[PDB]
Symmetry: D2
Subunit: 68 residues, 4 copies
């Protein structure tokens, strides 16, 4: 399920916004050229970066536990 | 379950490694990225990306 | 009437704030170490940078006009 | 009488010349420092400082 640069940038950008990192969000939106990203912001849920990251951890725990 | 500081360091490292100098600078401060208790040594390059990769594999396992 | 680095930094910082340059103000406050400046913000009037700059221009106009 | 864009370019140039990289970057955007109609050539280094210097001489002439 290959992930693109623009995707992670969107997840990060939205994380900065939601966490109240107003100044970082602004700076990152520009540096990452987020305006030029082809992603629909309205279809991205809140805490998305937090959610995937949480699942990423659990997935790795599952890989170790079966071979544990 | 991950914590705010852990997530913050992940995005912070990503920002540095991705060459987002000005974002890295501003976010280091706004986060108070230290003052927090994380050892940079135990977090490898692309860790944010890597954990996200495993997270999409998990989501692809839930719709299956 | 010698002017110091911290002084001009304060004038600029306050200009960014007042003009609504929220993100610049934040970034500059940090870069210029404005927290470490020995200046009393409460005794600095609004549009101070704009005012001095305006007077700076008028002063130069006066220097040219008498020799004009 | 000076204009918003003129003041903005002055502070912008000052930010660059003073090595405030991250401020210069953020302020270039937030200002929309161009999109505005100023020729960099006709504005010398330290122009912000210089005009401020003359402004304090003027204020010192008013209390006198």
């Amino acid at each position: 399920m290959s992930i693109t640069s623009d995707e992670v940038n969107f997840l990060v950008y939205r994380y900065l916004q939601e966490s109240g990192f107003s100044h970082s969000a602004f700076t990152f939106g520009i540096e990452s050229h987020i305006s030029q990203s082809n992603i629909n912001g309205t279809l991205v849920p809140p805490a998305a970066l937090i959610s995937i990251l949480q699942k990423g951890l659990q997935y790795v725990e599952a890989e170790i536990s079966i071979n544990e």
